Coordinates of C-alpha atoms and ligand atoms in Angstrom, one line a residue:
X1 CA 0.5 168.9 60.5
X2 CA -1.1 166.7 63.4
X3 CA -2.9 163.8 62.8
X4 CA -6.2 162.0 64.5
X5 CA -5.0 158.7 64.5
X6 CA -7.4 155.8 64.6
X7 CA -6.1 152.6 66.0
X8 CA -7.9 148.9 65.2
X9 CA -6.7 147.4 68.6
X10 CA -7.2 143.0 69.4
X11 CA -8.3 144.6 72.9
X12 CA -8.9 147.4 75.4
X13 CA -7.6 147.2 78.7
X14 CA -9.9 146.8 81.9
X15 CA -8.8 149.8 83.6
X16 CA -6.5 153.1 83.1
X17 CA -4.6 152.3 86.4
X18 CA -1.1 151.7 85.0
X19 CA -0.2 148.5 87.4
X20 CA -4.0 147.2 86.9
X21 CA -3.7 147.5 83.2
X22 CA -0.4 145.7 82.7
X23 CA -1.7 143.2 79.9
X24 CA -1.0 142.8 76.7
X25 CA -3.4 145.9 75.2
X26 CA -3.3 148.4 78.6
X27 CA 1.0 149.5 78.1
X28 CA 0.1 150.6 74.9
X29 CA -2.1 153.2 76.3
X30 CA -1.2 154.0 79.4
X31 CA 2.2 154.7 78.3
X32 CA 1.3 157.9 76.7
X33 CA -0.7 159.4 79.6
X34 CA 2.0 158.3 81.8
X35 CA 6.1 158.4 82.6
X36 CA 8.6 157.0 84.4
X37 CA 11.5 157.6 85.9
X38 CA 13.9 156.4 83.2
X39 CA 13.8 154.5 80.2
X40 CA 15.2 151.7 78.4
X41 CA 17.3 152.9 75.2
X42 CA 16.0 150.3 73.1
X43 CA 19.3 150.9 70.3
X44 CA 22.2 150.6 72.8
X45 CA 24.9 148.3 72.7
X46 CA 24.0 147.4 69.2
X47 CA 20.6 146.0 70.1
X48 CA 17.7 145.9 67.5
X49 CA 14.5 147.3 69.2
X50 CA 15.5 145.3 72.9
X51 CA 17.8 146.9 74.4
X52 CA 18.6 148.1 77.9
X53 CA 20.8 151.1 79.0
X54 CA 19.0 153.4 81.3
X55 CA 18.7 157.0 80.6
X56 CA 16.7 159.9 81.9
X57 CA 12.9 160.5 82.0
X58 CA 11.3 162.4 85.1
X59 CA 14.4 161.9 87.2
X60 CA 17.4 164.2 85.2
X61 CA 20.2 162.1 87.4
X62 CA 20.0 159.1 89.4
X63 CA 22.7 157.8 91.8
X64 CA 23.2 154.1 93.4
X65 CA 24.4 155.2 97.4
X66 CA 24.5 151.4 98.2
X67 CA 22.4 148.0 97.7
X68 CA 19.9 149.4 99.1
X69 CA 18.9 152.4 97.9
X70 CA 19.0 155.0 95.2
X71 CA 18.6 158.4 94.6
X72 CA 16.6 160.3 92.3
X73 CA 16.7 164.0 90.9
X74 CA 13.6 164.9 89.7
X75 CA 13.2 167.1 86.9
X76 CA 11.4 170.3 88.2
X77 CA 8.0 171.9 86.4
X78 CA 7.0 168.7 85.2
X79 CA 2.9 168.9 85.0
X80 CA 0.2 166.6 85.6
X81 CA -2.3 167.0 83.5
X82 CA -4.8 168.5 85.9
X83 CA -2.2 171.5 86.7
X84 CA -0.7 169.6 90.1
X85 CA 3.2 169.8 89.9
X86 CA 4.7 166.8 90.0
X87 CA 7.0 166.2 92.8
X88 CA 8.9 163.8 95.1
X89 CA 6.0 163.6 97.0
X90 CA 4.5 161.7 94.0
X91 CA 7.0 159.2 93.5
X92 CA 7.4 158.3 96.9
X93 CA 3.7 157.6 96.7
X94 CA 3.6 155.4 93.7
X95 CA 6.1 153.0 95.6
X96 CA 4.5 153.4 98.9
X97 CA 3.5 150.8 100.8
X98 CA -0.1 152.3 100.8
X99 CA -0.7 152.2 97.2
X100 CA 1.9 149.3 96.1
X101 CA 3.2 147.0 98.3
X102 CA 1.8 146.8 101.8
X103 CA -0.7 144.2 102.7
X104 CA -3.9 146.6 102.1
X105 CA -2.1 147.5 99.4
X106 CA -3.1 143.8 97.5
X107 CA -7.4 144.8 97.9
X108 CA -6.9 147.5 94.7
X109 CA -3.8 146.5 93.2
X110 CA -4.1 142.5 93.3
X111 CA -1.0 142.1 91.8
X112 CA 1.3 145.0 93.3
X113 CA 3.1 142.7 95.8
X114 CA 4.0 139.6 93.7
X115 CA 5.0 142.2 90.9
X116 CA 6.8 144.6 93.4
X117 CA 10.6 144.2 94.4
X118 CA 11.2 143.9 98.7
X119 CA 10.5 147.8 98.9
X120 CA 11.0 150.0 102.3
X121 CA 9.0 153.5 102.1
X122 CA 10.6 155.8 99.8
X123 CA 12.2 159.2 101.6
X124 CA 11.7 162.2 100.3
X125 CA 14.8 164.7 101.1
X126 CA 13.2 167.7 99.4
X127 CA 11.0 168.5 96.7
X128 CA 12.6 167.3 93.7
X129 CA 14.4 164.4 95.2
X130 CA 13.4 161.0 96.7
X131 CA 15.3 157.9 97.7
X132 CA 14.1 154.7 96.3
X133 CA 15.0 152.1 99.2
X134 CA 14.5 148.1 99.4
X135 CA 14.8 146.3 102.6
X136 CA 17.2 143.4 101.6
X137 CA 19.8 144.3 98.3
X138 CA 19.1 144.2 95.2
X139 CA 20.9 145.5 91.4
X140 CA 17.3 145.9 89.9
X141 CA 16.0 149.2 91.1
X142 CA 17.4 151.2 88.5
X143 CA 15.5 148.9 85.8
X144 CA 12.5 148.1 87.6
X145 CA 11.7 152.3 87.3
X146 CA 12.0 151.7 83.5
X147 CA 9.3 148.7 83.6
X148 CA 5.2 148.8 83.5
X149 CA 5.4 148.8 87.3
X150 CA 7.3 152.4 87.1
X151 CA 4.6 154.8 86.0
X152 CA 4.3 158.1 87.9
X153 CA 1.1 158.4 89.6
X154 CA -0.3 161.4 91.1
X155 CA -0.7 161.1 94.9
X156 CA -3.1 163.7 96.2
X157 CA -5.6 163.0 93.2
X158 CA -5.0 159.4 93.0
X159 CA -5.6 158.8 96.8
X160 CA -8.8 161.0 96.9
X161 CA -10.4 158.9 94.6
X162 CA -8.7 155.8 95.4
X163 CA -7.3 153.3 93.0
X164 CA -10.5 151.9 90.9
X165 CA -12.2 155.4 90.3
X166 CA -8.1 157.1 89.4
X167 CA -8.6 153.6 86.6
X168 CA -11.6 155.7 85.1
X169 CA -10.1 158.8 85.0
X170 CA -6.6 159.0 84.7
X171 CA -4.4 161.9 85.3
X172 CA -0.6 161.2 84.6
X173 CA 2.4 163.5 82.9
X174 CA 2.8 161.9 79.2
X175 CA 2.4 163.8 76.5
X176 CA -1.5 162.4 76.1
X177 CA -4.6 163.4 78.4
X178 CA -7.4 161.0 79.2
X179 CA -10.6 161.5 76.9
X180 CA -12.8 158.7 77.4
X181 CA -12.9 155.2 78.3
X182 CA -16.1 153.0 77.2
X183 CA -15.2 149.3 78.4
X184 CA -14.7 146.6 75.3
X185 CA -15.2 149.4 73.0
X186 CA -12.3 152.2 72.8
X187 CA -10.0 154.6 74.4
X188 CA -9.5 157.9 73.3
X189 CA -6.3 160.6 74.0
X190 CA -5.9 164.0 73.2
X191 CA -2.3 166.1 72.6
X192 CA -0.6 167.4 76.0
X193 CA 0.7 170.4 74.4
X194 CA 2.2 171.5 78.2
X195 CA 4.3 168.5 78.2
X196 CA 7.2 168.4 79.5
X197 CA 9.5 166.6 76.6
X198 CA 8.9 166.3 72.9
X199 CA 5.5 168.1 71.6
X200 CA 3.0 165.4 70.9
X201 CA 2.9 164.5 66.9
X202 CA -0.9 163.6 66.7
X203 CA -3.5 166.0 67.8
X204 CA -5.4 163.1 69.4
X205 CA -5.7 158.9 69.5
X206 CA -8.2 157.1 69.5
X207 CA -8.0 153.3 70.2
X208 CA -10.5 150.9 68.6
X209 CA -11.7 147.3 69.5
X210 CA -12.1 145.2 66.4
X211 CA -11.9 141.9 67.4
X212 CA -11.3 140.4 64.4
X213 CA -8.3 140.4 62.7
X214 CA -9.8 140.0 58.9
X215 CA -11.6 143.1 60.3
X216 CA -8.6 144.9 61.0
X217 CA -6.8 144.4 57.8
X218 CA -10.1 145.7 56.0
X219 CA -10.1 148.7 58.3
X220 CA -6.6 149.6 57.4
X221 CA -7.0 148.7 53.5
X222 CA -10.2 151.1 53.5
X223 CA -8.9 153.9 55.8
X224 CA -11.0 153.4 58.7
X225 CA -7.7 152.8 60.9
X226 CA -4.2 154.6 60.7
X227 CA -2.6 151.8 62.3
X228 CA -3.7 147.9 63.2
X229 CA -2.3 145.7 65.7
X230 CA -1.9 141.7 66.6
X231 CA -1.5 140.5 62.8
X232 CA 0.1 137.4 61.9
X233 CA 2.8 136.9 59.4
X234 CA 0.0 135.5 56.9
X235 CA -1.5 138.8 56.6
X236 CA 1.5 140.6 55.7
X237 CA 1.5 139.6 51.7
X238 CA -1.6 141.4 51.5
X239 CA -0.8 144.2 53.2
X240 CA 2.7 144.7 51.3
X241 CA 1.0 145.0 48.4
X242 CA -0.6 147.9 48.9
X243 CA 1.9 151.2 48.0
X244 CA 0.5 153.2 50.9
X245 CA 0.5 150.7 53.7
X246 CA 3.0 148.5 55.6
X247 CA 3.9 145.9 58.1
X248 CA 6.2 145.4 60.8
X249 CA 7.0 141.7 62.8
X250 CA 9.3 141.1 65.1
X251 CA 9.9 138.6 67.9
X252 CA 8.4 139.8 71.4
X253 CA 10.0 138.9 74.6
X254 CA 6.6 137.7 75.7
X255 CA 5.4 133.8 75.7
X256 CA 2.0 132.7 74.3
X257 CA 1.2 129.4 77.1
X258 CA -2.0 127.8 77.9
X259 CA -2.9 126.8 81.9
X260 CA -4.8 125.2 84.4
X261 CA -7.5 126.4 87.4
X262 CA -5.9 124.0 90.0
X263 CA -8.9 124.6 92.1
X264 CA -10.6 122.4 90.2
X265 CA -10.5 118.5 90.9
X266 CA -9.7 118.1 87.1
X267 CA -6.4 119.8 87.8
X268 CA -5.4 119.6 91.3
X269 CA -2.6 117.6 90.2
X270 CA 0.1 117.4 87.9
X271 CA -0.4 113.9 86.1
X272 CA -3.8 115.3 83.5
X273 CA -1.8 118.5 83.3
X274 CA 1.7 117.4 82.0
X275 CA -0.3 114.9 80.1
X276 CA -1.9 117.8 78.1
X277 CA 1.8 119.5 77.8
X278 CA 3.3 116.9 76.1
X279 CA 1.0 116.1 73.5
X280 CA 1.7 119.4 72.1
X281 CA 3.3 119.4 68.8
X282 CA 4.8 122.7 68.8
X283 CA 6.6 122.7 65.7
X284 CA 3.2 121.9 63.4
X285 CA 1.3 124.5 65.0
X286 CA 4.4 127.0 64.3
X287 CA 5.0 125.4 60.5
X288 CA 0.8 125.7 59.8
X289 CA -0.2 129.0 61.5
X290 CA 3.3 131.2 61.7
X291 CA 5.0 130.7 58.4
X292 CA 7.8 129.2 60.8
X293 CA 8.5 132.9 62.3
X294 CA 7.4 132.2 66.0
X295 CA 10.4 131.0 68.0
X296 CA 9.9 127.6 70.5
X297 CA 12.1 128.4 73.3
X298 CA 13.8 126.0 75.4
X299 CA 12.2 126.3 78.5
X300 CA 11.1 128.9 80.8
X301 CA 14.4 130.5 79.6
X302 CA 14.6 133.5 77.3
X303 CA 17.8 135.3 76.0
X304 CA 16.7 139.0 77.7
X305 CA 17.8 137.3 81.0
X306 CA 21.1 137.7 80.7
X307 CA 23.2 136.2 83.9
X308 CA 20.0 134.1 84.1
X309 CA 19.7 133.1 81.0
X310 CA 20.7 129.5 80.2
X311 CA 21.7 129.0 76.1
X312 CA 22.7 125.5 76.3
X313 CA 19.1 124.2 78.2
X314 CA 17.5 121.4 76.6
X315 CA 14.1 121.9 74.6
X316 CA 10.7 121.0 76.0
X317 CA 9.7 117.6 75.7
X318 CA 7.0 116.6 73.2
X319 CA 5.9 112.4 74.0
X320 CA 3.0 111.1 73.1
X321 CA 3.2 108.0 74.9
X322 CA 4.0 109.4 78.1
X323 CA 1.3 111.5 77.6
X324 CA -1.1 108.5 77.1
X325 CA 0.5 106.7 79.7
X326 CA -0.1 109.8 82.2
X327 CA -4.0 109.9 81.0
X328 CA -4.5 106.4 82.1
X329 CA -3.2 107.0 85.5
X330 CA -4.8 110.5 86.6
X331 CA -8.3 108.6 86.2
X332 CA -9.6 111.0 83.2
X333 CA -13.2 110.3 83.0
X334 CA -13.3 111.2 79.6
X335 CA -15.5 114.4 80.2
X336 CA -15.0 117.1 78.3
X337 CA -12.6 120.0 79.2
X338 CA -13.2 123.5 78.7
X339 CA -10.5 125.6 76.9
X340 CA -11.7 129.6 77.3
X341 CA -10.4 131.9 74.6
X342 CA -11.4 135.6 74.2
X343 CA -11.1 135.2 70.5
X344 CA -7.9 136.2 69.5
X345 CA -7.2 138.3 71.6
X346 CA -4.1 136.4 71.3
X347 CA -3.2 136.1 67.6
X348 CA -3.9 132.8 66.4
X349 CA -5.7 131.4 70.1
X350 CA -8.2 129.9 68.1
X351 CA -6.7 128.2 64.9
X352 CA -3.8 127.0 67.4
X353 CA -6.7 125.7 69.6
X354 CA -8.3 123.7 67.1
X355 CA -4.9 121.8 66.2
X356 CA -4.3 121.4 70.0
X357 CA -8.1 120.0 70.5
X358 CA -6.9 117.1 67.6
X359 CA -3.5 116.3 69.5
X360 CA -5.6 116.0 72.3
X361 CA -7.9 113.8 71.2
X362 CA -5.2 111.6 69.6
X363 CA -4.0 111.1 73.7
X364 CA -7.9 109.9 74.4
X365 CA -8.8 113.5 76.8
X366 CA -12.0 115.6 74.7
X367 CA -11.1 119.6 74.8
X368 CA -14.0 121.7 74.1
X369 CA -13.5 125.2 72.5
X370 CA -15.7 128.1 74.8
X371 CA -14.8 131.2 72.2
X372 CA -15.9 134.5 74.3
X373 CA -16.2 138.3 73.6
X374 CA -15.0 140.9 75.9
X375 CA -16.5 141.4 79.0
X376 CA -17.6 137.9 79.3
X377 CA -15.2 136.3 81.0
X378 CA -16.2 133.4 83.1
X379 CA -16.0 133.3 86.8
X380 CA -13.3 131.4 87.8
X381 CA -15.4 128.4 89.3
X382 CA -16.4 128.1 85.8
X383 CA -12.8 128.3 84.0
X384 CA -10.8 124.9 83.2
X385 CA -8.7 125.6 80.7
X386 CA -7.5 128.9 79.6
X387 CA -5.2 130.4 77.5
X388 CA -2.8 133.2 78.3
X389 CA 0.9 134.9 78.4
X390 CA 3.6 136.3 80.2
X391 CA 5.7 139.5 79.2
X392 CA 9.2 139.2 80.3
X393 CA 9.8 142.7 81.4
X394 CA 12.9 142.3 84.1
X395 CA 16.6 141.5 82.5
X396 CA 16.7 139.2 85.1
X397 CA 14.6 135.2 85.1
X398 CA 12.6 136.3 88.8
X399 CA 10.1 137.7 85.8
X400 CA 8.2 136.0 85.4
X401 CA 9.1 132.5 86.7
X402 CA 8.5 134.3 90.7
X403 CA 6.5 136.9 89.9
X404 CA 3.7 135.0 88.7
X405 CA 4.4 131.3 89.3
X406 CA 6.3 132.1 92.9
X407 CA 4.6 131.5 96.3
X408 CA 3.4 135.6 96.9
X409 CA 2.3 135.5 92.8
X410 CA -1.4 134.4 91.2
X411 CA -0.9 131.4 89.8
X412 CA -0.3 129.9 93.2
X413 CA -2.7 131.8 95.4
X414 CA -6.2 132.7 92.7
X415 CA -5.2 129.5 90.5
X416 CA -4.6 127.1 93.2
X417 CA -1.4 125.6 92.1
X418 CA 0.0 123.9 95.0
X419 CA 3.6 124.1 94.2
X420 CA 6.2 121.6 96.0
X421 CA 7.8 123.1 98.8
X422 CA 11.1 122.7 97.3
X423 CA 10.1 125.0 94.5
X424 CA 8.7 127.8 97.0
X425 CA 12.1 127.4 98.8
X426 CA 14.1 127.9 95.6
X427 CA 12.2 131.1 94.8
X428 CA 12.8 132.7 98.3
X429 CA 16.3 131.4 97.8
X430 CA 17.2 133.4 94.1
X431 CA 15.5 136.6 95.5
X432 CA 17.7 137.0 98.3
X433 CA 21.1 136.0 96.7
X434 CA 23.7 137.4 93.8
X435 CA 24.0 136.5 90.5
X436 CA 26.3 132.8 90.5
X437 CA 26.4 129.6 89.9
X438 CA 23.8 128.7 92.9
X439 CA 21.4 131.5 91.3
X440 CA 22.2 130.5 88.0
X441 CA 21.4 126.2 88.8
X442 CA 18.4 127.2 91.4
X443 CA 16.6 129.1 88.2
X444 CA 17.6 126.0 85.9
X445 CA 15.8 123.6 88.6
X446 CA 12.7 126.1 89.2
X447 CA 12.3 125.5 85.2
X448 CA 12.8 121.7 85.4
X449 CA 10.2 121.6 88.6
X450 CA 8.0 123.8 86.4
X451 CA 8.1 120.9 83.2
X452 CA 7.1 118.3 85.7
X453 CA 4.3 120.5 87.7
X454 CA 2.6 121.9 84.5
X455 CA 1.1 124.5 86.2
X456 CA 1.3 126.1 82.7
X457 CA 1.9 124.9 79.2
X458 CA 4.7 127.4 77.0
X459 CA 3.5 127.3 73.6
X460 CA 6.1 129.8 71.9
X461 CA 7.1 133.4 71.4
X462 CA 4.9 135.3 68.7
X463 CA 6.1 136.7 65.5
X464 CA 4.0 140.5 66.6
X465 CA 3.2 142.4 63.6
X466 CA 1.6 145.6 62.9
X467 CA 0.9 147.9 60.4
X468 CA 0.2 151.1 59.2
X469 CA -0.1 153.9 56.5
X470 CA 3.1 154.6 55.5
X471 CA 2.5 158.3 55.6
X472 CA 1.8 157.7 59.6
X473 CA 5.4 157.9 60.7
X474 CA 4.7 157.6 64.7
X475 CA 3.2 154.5 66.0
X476 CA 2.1 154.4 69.7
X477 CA 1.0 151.0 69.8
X478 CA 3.6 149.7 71.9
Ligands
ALX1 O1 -2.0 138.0 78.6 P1 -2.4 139.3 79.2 O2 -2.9 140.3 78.2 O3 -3.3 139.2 80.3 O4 -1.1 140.1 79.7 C1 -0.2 139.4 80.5 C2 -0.4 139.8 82.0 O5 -1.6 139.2 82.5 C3 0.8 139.4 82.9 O6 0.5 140.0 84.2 C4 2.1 140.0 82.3 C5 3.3 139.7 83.1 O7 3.5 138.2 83.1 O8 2.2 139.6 81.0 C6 1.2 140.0 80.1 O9 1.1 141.4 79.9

């Protein structure tokens, strides 16, 4: 009655760590050998797959004492997967500012402090209960222990081996134990039958790279995978048309963009980027590669924002002659630009690539395609151009706008962008006020500051689609 499943993956995270894994291919496995504290009900208030009510996980009961702070009750017995009882020892430590968001904190978990909310330690009252605690208010506790960044680590094994070696060997509470890890190649995760909720379905998962996607389809249409992830729409005709398979799309509250090393002369200001922005036709690539199912939004603006979220913003500006005009005055040498891809990695990097390459061209800059495998990524004196994308995992617009394009995030401080001061000065502004009309307008001039800079490119929103053997009824590919 339990299955082996065997999963034809676009990628396989770097690491097991569950904050050093956040990517687009590490939640999808780390969120069975780990938990958090609560969890998004993905069905309430009518919502389709997206929703957000909070509702219990390791903590049975949580309670809001005052802007500051919150209470957890931890449920009790709950088992690492080594033997260690959980406790609130544990939790304090996985939002201490040792491991997360301290300043030595930033050597093994790069991106803990641009990713973390303005934490104070954590007290622990007694076993089972800690207080979460932040040193200026915020609403977004609650949520931000649903999120990637929540996931329970355990502290005395996790600090003996430190954070990089705990990445190779991972020992969380989730109803999967740690097998093996071989880098580019697969993960595999066997039942935790001492689990603490549901008894595990499958007997054990295994997680495959296959880089290509035609690959993938094959493997599913010759049972060599159970389930196949990062298709397109294109491929679901196919698929459909076999009785014992099927596919799944939706729209993902994630962005496909392309950016900039703005260490490099090339890019160390705005006039050659924003060039390359708007000489993007978004709507052809969308029409020609996504049957028209990937959404454009309109701006650095998406609808799982809520207070933040601005329906009535303008759309992103597509103008060739600006773009031209904006060629002519950055001093473009006419030497070619490298654009790094891992493949598709992203679904459709490199078709969309090529048609960017001709729009390009049609502005006078020449955009060469460097197509890599994984594991040979290019240092980043070497990168130019790059592709990437941003999961929008807060209800809230300070993900990912601050987190990663704000003074403390990466884009700024490993990319080089060197952001006007006004826009650094809007970010520490919306983290330390309320949802209003100055919060509101700051996040709406943040977006317009981000059109002029370029320090990235939005492309669109993915139509995500999977599938599977219809006789595999549980998916953990998400
Ligand atoms: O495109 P990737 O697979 O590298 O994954 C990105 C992360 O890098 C990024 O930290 C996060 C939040 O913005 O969104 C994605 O998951």
């Amino acid at each position: 009655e339990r299955r082996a499943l065997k999963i034809g993956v676009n990628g396989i995270p770097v690491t097991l760590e569950p904050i050093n894994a956040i990517s687009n291919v590490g939640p999808r496995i780390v969120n069975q050998i780990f938990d958090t504290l609560v969890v998004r009900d993905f069905f309430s208030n009518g919502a389709p797959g997206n929703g957000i009510n909070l509702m219990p996980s390791l903590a049975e009961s949580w309670e809001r004492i005052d802007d500051k702070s919150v209470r957890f009750k931890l449920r009790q017995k709950v088992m690492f997967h080594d033997g260690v009882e959980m406790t609130a020892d544990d939790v304090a430590y996985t939002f201490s500012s040792e491991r997360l968001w301290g300043p030595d904190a930033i050597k093994v978990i790069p991106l803990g402090g641009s990713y973390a909310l303005d934490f104070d330690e954590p007290v622990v009252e007694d076993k089972y209960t800690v207080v979460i605690r932040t040193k200026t208010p915020t609403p977004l506790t609650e949520s931000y222990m649903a999120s990637w960044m929540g996931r329970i680590v355990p502290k005395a094994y996790y600090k003996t081996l430190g954070t990089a070696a705990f990445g190779n060997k991972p020992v969380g509470t989730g109803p999967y134990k740690f097998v093996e890890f071989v880098a580019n190649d697969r993960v595999v995760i066997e039942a935790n039958d001492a689990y603490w909720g549901l008894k595990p379905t499958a007997s054990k998962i295994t997680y495959q790279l296959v880089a290509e996607p035609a690959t993938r389809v094959a493997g599913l249409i010759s049972g060599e995978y159970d389930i196949v992830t990062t298709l397109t729409p294109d491929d679901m005709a196919l698929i459909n048309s076999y009785p014992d398979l099927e596919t799944r799309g939706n729209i993902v509250e994630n962005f496909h963009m392309f950016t900039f090393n703005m260490n490099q002369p090339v890019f160390q200001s705005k006039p050659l980027r924003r060039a390359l922005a708007l000489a993007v036709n978004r709507p052809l690539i969308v029409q020609s590669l996504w049957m028209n199912k990937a959404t454009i939004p309109n701006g650095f603006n998406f609808p799982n924002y809520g207070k933040t979220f601005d329906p009535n913003r303008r759309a992103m500006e597509y103008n060739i002659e600006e773009a031209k005009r904006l060629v002519k005055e950055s001093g473009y040498d006419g030497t070619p630009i490298t654009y790094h891809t891992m493949g598709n990695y992203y679904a459709n990097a490199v078709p969309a690539l090529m048609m960017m390459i001709e729009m390009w061209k049609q502005i006078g800059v020449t955009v060469v395609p460097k197509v890599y495998a994984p594991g040979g990524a290019p240092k980043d004196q070497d990168s130019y151009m790059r592709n990437w994308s941003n999961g929008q995992w807060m209800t809230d617009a300070w993900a990912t706008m601050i987190c990663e394009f704000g003074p403390k995030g990466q884009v700024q401080k490993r990319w080089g962008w060197k952001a006007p001061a006004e826009f650094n000065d809007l970010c520490t502004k919306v983290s330390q006020i309320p949802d209003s009309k100055e919060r509101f307008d700051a996040f709406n001039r943040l977006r317009d500051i981000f059109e002029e800079e370029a320090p990235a490119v939005i492309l669109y929103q993915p139509f995500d689609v999977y599938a599977a053997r219809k006789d595999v009824h549980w998916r953990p590919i998400s």
